[PDB]
Coordinates of C-alpha atoms in Angstrom, one line a residue:
Chain A
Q29 CA 30.2 -179.7 -68.0
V30 CA 33.0 -179.7 -65.3
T31 CA 31.3 -178.9 -61.9
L32 CA 31.4 -179.2 -58.1
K33 CA 28.4 -179.0 -55.9
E34 CA 28.5 -178.8 -52.1
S35 CA 25.7 -180.1 -49.8
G36 CA 25.0 -180.7 -46.1
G37 CA 25.1 -177.1 -44.9
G38 CA 22.6 -175.9 -42.2
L39 CA 22.1 -174.6 -38.7
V40 CA 23.9 -176.4 -35.9
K41 CA 24.4 -175.8 -32.1
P42 CA 28.0 -175.0 -30.8
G43 CA 29.6 -178.3 -29.9
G44 CA 27.5 -180.0 -32.6
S45 CA 28.6 -182.1 -35.6
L46 CA 27.8 -181.7 -39.4
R47 CA 29.0 -183.6 -42.5
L48 CA 29.5 -181.7 -45.7
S49 CA 29.6 -183.4 -49.2
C50 CA 30.9 -182.2 -52.5
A51 CA 29.7 -183.9 -55.7
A52 CA 32.2 -183.8 -58.7
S53 CA 30.9 -184.0 -62.3
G54 CA 32.5 -184.2 -65.8
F55 CA 36.1 -185.1 -64.8
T56 CA 38.2 -187.9 -63.5
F57 CA 37.9 -187.1 -59.8
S58 CA 40.4 -189.8 -58.7
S59 CA 43.3 -187.8 -60.5
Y60 CA 43.0 -184.5 -58.5
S61 CA 43.8 -183.2 -55.1
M62 CA 40.7 -181.4 -53.6
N63 CA 40.3 -178.6 -51.1
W64 CA 37.8 -177.0 -48.7
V65 CA 38.0 -173.2 -48.5
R66 CA 35.5 -171.3 -46.3
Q67 CA 34.2 -167.7 -46.1
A68 CA 32.6 -166.2 -43.0
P69 CA 29.7 -163.8 -44.0
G70 CA 31.3 -160.5 -45.2
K71 CA 34.9 -161.8 -44.5
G72 CA 37.8 -163.2 -46.5
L73 CA 38.5 -166.6 -47.9
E74 CA 40.1 -169.0 -45.4
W75 CA 41.6 -172.3 -46.6
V76 CA 40.4 -175.2 -44.4
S77 CA 41.8 -178.6 -45.6
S78 CA 43.1 -180.6 -48.6
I79 CA 43.4 -184.2 -49.6
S80 CA 45.4 -185.8 -52.4
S81 CA 44.0 -188.1 -55.2
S82 CA 44.7 -191.4 -53.3
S83 CA 44.1 -189.8 -49.8
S84 CA 47.9 -190.3 -49.0
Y85 CA 48.5 -186.6 -48.1
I86 CA 46.0 -184.6 -45.9
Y87 CA 46.5 -181.1 -44.5
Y88 CA 44.5 -178.9 -42.2
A89 CA 44.5 -175.2 -41.3
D90 CA 45.5 -174.6 -37.7
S91 CA 42.0 -173.2 -36.9
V92 CA 40.3 -176.7 -37.6
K93 CA 43.0 -179.3 -36.6
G94 CA 41.6 -182.0 -34.4
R95 CA 38.0 -181.0 -35.0
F96 CA 37.6 -181.5 -38.8
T97 CA 38.3 -184.5 -40.9
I98 CA 38.6 -184.5 -44.7
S99 CA 37.9 -187.7 -46.7
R100 CA 37.0 -188.7 -50.2
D101 CA 35.2 -191.6 -51.9
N102 CA 36.5 -191.7 -55.5
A103 CA 33.9 -194.4 -56.5
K104 CA 31.2 -191.9 -55.6
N105 CA 33.1 -188.7 -57.0
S106 CA 32.7 -187.3 -53.5
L107 CA 34.7 -185.1 -51.2
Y108 CA 33.6 -184.9 -47.5
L109 CA 34.2 -182.6 -44.5
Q110 CA 33.3 -184.2 -41.1
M111 CA 33.1 -181.2 -38.7
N112 CA 32.9 -182.1 -34.9
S113 CA 33.1 -179.8 -31.9
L114 CA 31.7 -176.9 -34.0
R115 CA 32.2 -173.4 -32.8
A116 CA 30.5 -170.0 -33.6
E117 CA 33.8 -169.0 -35.5
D118 CA 33.1 -172.0 -38.0
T119 CA 30.1 -170.1 -39.4
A120 CA 30.8 -169.7 -43.1
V121 CA 29.9 -170.6 -46.7
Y122 CA 32.1 -173.8 -47.4
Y123 CA 33.5 -174.2 -50.9
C124 CA 34.8 -177.3 -52.5
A125 CA 37.7 -176.5 -55.0
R126 CA 39.6 -178.7 -57.5
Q127 CA 43.4 -178.3 -57.5
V128 CA 45.4 -178.4 -60.9
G129 CA 48.1 -181.0 -60.7
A130 CA 50.7 -179.1 -62.7
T131 CA 50.2 -175.6 -61.1
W132 CA 48.3 -176.1 -57.7
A133 CA 45.8 -173.4 -58.9
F134 CA 42.1 -173.9 -57.7
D135 CA 40.5 -174.0 -61.2
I136 CA 37.0 -175.2 -60.4
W137 CA 34.9 -174.1 -57.3
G138 CA 31.4 -175.2 -56.2
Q139 CA 28.6 -172.6 -55.4
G140 CA 29.1 -173.2 -51.7
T141 CA 27.1 -174.5 -48.7
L142 CA 26.2 -172.3 -45.7
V143 CA 27.1 -173.6 -42.2
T144 CA 25.6 -171.6 -39.3
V145 CA 26.8 -172.4 -35.8
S146 CA 24.6 -170.7 -33.2
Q147 CA 45.1 -163.2 -39.0
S148 CA 45.9 -163.9 -42.7
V149 CA 49.6 -164.9 -43.3
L150 CA 49.5 -163.1 -46.7
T151 CA 48.5 -159.5 -46.6
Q152 CA 46.8 -157.2 -49.0
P153 CA 45.6 -153.6 -48.8
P154 CA 41.9 -153.7 -47.8
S155 CA 40.7 -151.5 -50.7
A156 CA 41.7 -150.2 -54.2
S157 CA 40.0 -147.9 -56.6
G158 CA 40.1 -146.4 -60.1
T159 CA 38.0 -144.7 -62.8
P160 CA 37.2 -146.7 -66.1
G161 CA 40.3 -147.1 -68.3
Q162 CA 42.7 -146.4 -65.5
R163 CA 45.4 -148.9 -64.3
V164 CA 45.2 -150.3 -60.7
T165 CA 47.7 -152.5 -58.8
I166 CA 46.9 -154.8 -55.9
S167 CA 49.8 -156.1 -53.8
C168 CA 50.2 -159.4 -51.9
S169 CA 52.8 -159.5 -49.2
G170 CA 54.2 -162.8 -47.9
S171 CA 57.5 -164.3 -46.8
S172 CA 60.3 -166.8 -47.4
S173 CA 58.3 -170.1 -46.8
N174 CA 55.2 -169.1 -48.9
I175 CA 55.6 -166.5 -51.8
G176 CA 59.4 -166.7 -51.5
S177 CA 59.3 -170.5 -52.2
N178 CA 56.1 -171.1 -54.1
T179 CA 54.0 -169.6 -56.9
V180 CA 51.1 -167.2 -56.3
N181 CA 47.5 -167.6 -57.5
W182 CA 44.9 -164.8 -57.7
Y183 CA 41.1 -165.3 -57.4
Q184 CA 38.4 -162.9 -58.4
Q185 CA 35.1 -162.9 -56.4
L186 CA 32.2 -160.9 -57.9
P187 CA 29.4 -159.9 -55.5
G188 CA 27.1 -162.9 -54.7
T189 CA 29.4 -165.3 -56.6
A190 CA 31.9 -168.1 -55.8
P191 CA 35.6 -167.2 -56.3
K192 CA 37.1 -167.9 -59.8
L193 CA 40.7 -168.5 -60.8
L194 CA 42.1 -165.3 -62.3
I195 CA 45.9 -165.9 -62.4
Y196 CA 48.0 -169.0 -61.7
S197 CA 51.8 -169.7 -61.5
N198 CA 52.3 -165.9 -60.7
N199 CA 51.4 -164.5 -64.1
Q200 CA 49.6 -167.1 -66.2
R201 CA 45.9 -166.4 -67.3
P202 CA 43.4 -169.3 -67.6
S203 CA 41.2 -169.3 -70.7
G204 CA 38.4 -166.8 -70.3
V205 CA 40.4 -164.3 -68.3
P206 CA 41.0 -161.1 -70.4
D207 CA 44.5 -159.9 -71.1
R208 CA 43.8 -156.7 -69.1
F209 CA 44.7 -158.8 -65.9
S210 CA 48.3 -159.5 -65.3
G211 CA 50.5 -160.7 -62.4
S212 CA 54.1 -160.5 -61.2
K213 CA 56.1 -161.8 -58.2
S214 CA 59.3 -160.3 -56.8
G215 CA 61.0 -161.7 -53.7
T216 CA 58.4 -162.4 -51.1
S217 CA 55.8 -160.0 -52.8
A218 CA 53.3 -160.4 -55.7
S219 CA 51.1 -158.0 -57.5
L220 CA 48.0 -158.1 -59.6
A221 CA 47.6 -155.4 -62.3
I222 CA 44.3 -154.4 -64.0
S223 CA 44.8 -152.2 -67.1
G224 CA 41.9 -150.3 -68.7
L225 CA 39.5 -150.8 -65.7
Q226 CA 36.0 -152.0 -66.6
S227 CA 32.7 -151.8 -64.6
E228 CA 32.7 -155.7 -64.3
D229 CA 36.1 -155.6 -62.6
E230 CA 34.3 -154.3 -59.4
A231 CA 35.1 -157.3 -57.1
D232 CA 37.0 -158.7 -54.2
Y233 CA 40.5 -160.0 -55.2
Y234 CA 42.5 -162.7 -53.2
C235 CA 46.0 -163.9 -53.5
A236 CA 47.0 -167.4 -52.3
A237 CA 50.2 -169.6 -52.0
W238 CA 51.4 -172.8 -50.4
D239 CA 53.4 -172.2 -47.2
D240 CA 56.3 -174.7 -46.6
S241 CA 56.5 -173.9 -42.8
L242 CA 52.8 -174.1 -42.0
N243 CA 52.2 -177.0 -44.5
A244 CA 49.0 -175.1 -45.4
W245 CA 47.6 -172.9 -48.1
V246 CA 47.5 -169.3 -47.1
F247 CA 45.1 -166.8 -48.6
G248 CA 45.5 -163.0 -48.5
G249 CA 42.9 -161.0 -46.6
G250 CA 41.5 -159.7 -49.9
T251 CA 41.2 -156.3 -51.6
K252 CA 37.8 -154.8 -52.4
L253 CA 38.2 -153.0 -55.8
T254 CA 35.7 -150.2 -56.6
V255 CA 35.4 -148.7 -60.1
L256 CA 34.4 -145.0 -59.7
Chain B
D23 CA 60.3 -195.9 -44.3
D24 CA 57.1 -196.1 -46.4
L25 CA 58.3 -193.7 -49.1
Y26 CA 61.5 -195.7 -50.0
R27 CA 59.6 -199.0 -50.0
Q28 CA 56.7 -197.6 -52.1
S29 CA 59.1 -195.8 -54.6
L30 CA 61.2 -199.0 -54.9
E31 CA 58.1 -201.2 -55.7
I32 CA 56.9 -198.7 -58.5
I33 CA 60.4 -198.2 -60.1
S34 CA 61.4 -201.9 -59.9
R35 CA 58.0 -203.1 -61.3
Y36 CA 58.3 -200.5 -64.1
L37 CA 61.9 -201.5 -65.0
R38 CA 61.2 -205.3 -64.9
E39 CA 58.1 -205.1 -67.2
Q40 CA 60.0 -202.7 -69.6
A41 CA 62.8 -205.4 -69.8
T42 CA 60.3 -208.3 -70.2
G43 CA 58.1 -206.4 -72.6
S44 CA 54.8 -207.5 -71.0
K45 CA 52.7 -205.3 -68.6
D46 CA 52.2 -207.0 -65.2
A47 CA 45.9 -198.1 -55.5
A48 CA 48.3 -195.1 -55.1
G49 CA 51.2 -197.2 -56.4
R50 CA 48.9 -198.8 -59.0
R51 CA 47.9 -195.3 -60.5
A52 CA 51.6 -194.2 -60.3
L53 CA 52.6 -197.2 -62.4
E54 CA 49.8 -196.5 -65.0
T55 CA 51.1 -192.9 -65.3
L56 CA 54.8 -194.0 -65.4
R57 CA 54.0 -196.4 -68.3
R58 CA 52.3 -193.6 -70.2
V59 CA 54.8 -190.8 -69.5
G60 CA 57.9 -193.1 -69.3
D61 CA 57.3 -194.9 -72.7
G62 CA 56.8 -191.4 -74.1
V63 CA 60.2 -190.1 -72.8
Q64 CA 61.9 -193.2 -74.1
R65 CA 60.4 -192.7 -77.7
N66 CA 61.1 -188.9 -77.8
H67 CA 64.7 -189.1 -76.3
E68 CA 65.6 -192.5 -78.0
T69 CA 68.7 -191.1 -79.7
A70 CA 69.9 -189.1 -76.6
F71 CA 69.3 -192.2 -74.4
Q72 CA 71.4 -194.4 -76.9
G73 CA 74.3 -191.9 -76.6
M74 CA 74.2 -191.8 -72.7
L75 CA 74.2 -195.7 -72.7
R76 CA 77.3 -196.0 -75.0
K77 CA 79.1 -193.3 -72.8
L78 CA 78.2 -195.2 -69.6
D79 CA 79.2 -198.6 -71.1
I80 CA 77.1 -200.9 -68.9
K81 CA 78.2 -204.5 -69.5
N82 CA 78.1 -206.1 -66.0
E83 CA 77.0 -205.9 -62.2
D84 CA 80.0 -203.7 -61.4
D85 CA 78.9 -201.0 -63.9
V86 CA 75.4 -201.0 -62.4
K87 CA 77.0 -200.4 -58.9
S88 CA 78.8 -197.3 -60.3
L89 CA 75.7 -195.9 -62.2
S90 CA 74.5 -193.9 -59.1
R91 CA 77.5 -191.4 -59.6
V92 CA 76.2 -189.7 -62.9
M93 CA 72.6 -189.5 -61.4
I94 CA 73.8 -187.5 -58.3
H95 CA 76.0 -185.2 -60.5
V96 CA 73.2 -184.4 -63.0
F97 CA 71.0 -183.4 -60.0
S98 CA 73.9 -181.2 -58.8
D99 CA 72.7 -178.1 -60.9
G100 CA 70.0 -177.5 -58.1
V101 CA 67.1 -178.2 -60.4
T102 CA 64.3 -180.5 -59.2
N103 CA 61.0 -181.1 -61.0
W104 CA 58.8 -184.1 -62.0
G105 CA 60.1 -183.8 -65.6
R106 CA 63.7 -184.5 -64.5
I107 CA 62.6 -187.3 -62.1
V108 CA 60.5 -189.1 -64.8
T109 CA 63.5 -188.7 -67.3
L110 CA 65.8 -190.5 -64.7
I111 CA 63.3 -193.4 -64.3
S112 CA 62.7 -193.6 -68.1
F113 CA 66.5 -193.8 -68.7
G114 CA 66.6 -196.6 -66.0
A115 CA 63.9 -198.5 -68.1
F116 CA 66.1 -198.0 -71.2
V117 CA 69.2 -199.4 -69.4
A118 CA 67.0 -202.3 -68.1
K119 CA 66.0 -203.2 -71.8
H120 CA 69.8 -203.2 -72.8
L121 CA 70.7 -205.3 -69.7
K122 CA 68.0 -207.9 -70.9
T123 CA 69.7 -208.1 -74.4
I124 CA 73.2 -208.8 -72.9
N125 CA 71.8 -211.6 -70.6
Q126 CA 72.2 -209.3 -67.5
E127 CA 68.6 -209.6 -66.2
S128 CA 70.0 -210.0 -62.7
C129 CA 71.3 -206.4 -62.9
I130 CA 67.7 -204.8 -63.2
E131 CA 66.9 -205.2 -59.4
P132 CA 70.2 -203.3 -58.2
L133 CA 69.7 -200.7 -61.0
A134 CA 66.1 -200.1 -59.7
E135 CA 67.6 -200.0 -56.1
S136 CA 70.2 -197.4 -57.3
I137 CA 67.6 -195.2 -59.0
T138 CA 65.4 -195.3 -55.9
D139 CA 68.4 -194.7 -53.5
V140 CA 69.5 -191.5 -55.4
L141 CA 65.8 -190.3 -55.6
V142 CA 64.6 -190.9 -52.0
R143 CA 68.0 -189.9 -50.4
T144 CA 68.8 -186.7 -52.2
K145 CA 65.1 -185.5 -52.9
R146 CA 63.1 -186.8 -49.9
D147 CA 62.0 -183.3 -48.8
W148 CA 61.0 -182.2 -52.3
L149 CA 59.1 -185.5 -52.9
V150 CA 57.2 -185.2 -49.6
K151 CA 56.3 -181.5 -50.3
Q152 CA 55.0 -182.6 -53.7
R153 CA 52.6 -185.3 -52.2
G154 CA 54.9 -188.1 -53.3
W155 CA 53.4 -190.6 -55.8
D156 CA 49.9 -188.9 -55.4
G157 CA 51.5 -185.7 -56.7
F158 CA 53.4 -187.6 -59.5
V159 CA 50.0 -188.9 -60.8
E160 CA 48.3 -185.5 -60.4
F161 CA 51.1 -183.6 -62.1
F162 CA 51.0 -185.8 -65.2
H163 CA 47.2 -186.1 -65.4
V164 CA 45.8 -185.6 -69.0

């Protein structure tokens, strides 16, 4: 059983500190880059930070630089996020996600841990709709340093669930993703196509890519898909 | 520069132990991966590597000094990926075994230097974006 489980979430005062942990099970943790991705209640996914297998390469989103510190202890199969100088805008569910070495897709995600303290570079249309059996298309717009230079990944987030890898390397499906889902990339744009819409496809969809200028992962704002 | 120094240690250590025939943290894990992947590329491309060796005709120190030329010209097609990089290092190990048979053990160190030079000089930006030797280990994890 390959899993991740986040811990340490809770209520904190602005200016306060909190340390998150993520426990990895069923895999060789020391051979993977790991990431933190957060989600403010009712808002899109926001990438936070990433750390390579031997901690040699660390990256932070602009919104957390100087305040958050990522670390890992491979002997304890553990990923950490030390958050200092917490702000109201840091309120979110924090997800731990394993990165695939060959593709950079986030294939395993934890359930998340809620942190309560009391703009996206890729763009997507906020909504999409269709009737069962119809074909729907969701676009993801980027630029030269991200989609124009790097592959695109798509994540599906069903209501009340953690995101799941849907598409990687622009158009590849992981095992367990039906062939009704497909992806394409052209220039600085990408698109997710869902053929023969099904009731269970009602979800939020996010595209993501590495950005060479920002030295950060950039997630799209998300598209809420309704099946009428 | 930490990247050149680290890359040199890994590649030289790998080429030396491949010549000798006896196995000797980020660098450590990169070496374990390179032994697994590199020995695999050498077995799978043994005939192609033999042909490249005869064509290059490495018999002394002066041939090792001119070996960098081919490496820069193969990378001139604008293609960069870990597969190409590990093929270059595995070919370097193959040449280091041949150098050991013709009593040219002293040529392994400049050969390692030459491979590292071409790699770190022409592909520094790509290597850095790919998380260097951490990315090398992650890319080939099985």
